[PDB]
């Protein structure tokens, strides 16, 4: 059997797996614990991808398809209907054992990004292009990636073509106010109000008391308004890619990992790397973890559930 290992990346060399953002700090939250069941950045330790997790960093919260038509409405803004496919270009098959097309956002909110188009037809001999700011509401009833059809809005009121290859590039969030409906741990309704979600990645929770989830925290930009929103992933995208590569069989339900300062070789704190792909620590405090960014996680050994984590 192939020996299990982690990639040797420092905290400043990691990216979020739920949004295309760099990892800023480590984060715990024993208080106000919610049901953690994200779908992006989900990978078991033996290299099995779960939920809507895919390998491309540019595929996270991304969409590719064609704009069908302009939605006529008297409400503010200009809404456009868009059929979505797989990221590679192939049509999305809803009979597949996936909650949504891979890369689909796994939280409620207004995703702020850029819609770009490149025409299929050529005019005497280059295709025309266009790109505008756009917002995608994942809480909307029109947000149905499972049915291969979502809907986005623009400030532009005309310059969007129909039947042309469309790409969505995630930038951040439009707003985090009351009516914005931004909740990090609230899964979107992939099929809308039609039916409930299926083929989801399993929920995540610490088993032993006194232990809490250890998150990789990234701060996400805002189009406007007040706030300092953040996105927490279970594992960075580099870990997802690495675990998929080695495909090492898990010997235990929990693996002990150590956050080591490479300059002095010191172990700052311990952590439990669980089989399904998440970290737990024995910490009482909350908020950001004070630790050098040049520090990295190192796999120590597989352990039984008799082992107790060091106080953090």
């Amino acid at each position: 059997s192939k020996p299990f290992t982690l990639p040797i990346l420092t905290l400043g060399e990691l990216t979020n797996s739920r949004f295309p953002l760099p990892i800023d700090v480590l984060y715990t939250n024993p208080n106000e614990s919610a049901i953690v069941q994200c779908q992006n950045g989900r990978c078991t330790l033996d290299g099995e991808l779960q939920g809507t997790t895919q390998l491309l960093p540019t595929g996270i919260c991304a969409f590719r398809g064609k704009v069908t038509q302009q939605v006529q409405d008297e409400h503010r803004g200009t809404h456009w209907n868009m059929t979505v496919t797989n990221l590679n270009g192939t049509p999305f098959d809803p009979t597949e054992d996936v909650p949504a097309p891979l890369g689909t956002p796994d939280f409620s909110g207004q995703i702020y990004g850029v819609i770009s188009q490149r025409n299929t037809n050529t005019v005497p001999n280059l295709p025309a292009n266009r790109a505008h700011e756009a917002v995608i509401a994942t809480y909307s009833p029109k947000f149905t990636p499972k049915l291969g059809n979502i809907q986005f809005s623009t400030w532009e009121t005309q310059d969007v073509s129909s039947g042309q290859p469309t790409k969505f590039t995630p930038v951040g969030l439009a707003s985090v106010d009351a009516n914005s409906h931004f909740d990090q741990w609230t899964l979107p309704s992939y099929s809308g109000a039609l039916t409930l979600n299926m083929n989801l990645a399993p929920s995540v929770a610490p088993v032993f008391p006194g232990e809490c989830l250890l998150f990789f925290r990234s701060f996400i930009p805002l189009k406007g308004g007040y706030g300092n929103p953040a996105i927490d992933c279970l594992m960075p995208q580099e870990w997802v890619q690495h675990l998929y590569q080695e495909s090492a069989p898990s010997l235990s339900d929990v693996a002990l990992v150590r956050y080591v300062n490479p300059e002095t070789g010191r172990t700052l704190f311990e952590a439990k790397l669980h089989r399904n792909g998440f970290l737990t620590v024995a910490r009482n405090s909350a908020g950001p973890v004070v630790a050098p960014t040049n520090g990295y996680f190192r796999f120590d050994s597989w352990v039984n559930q008799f082992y107790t984590l060091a106080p953090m």
Epitope: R258, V260, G265, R266, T267, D300, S301, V303, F306, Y307, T308
Partner: nanobody
Amino acid sequence: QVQLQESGGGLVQPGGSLRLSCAASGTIFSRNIMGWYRQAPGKERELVASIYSDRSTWYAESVEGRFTISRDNVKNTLYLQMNSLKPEDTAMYYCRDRTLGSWGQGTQVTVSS
């Protein structure tokens, strides 16, 4: 026949130096994680230092910079150098095989005038 025996405990003046040892027997010493605990009267058993298979070390914030833990895989002995002692360090020090879970008898360390 698995037993851990501590040695080198006693009384000493504050700001002095003291060294503790722990001879392990009947274990796969080099593979296991070793650590030093202490227990003050009215307090719980708090982890002080811990050493791993790759000889990496961990220390508590109320100990860092003063104590030093090391291991000898040849003689299967665990050490703990204690420099610049304080009256707050007065407790019962136990050595433990954190991997296997086996404790030791524990020795007494007191620092007063």
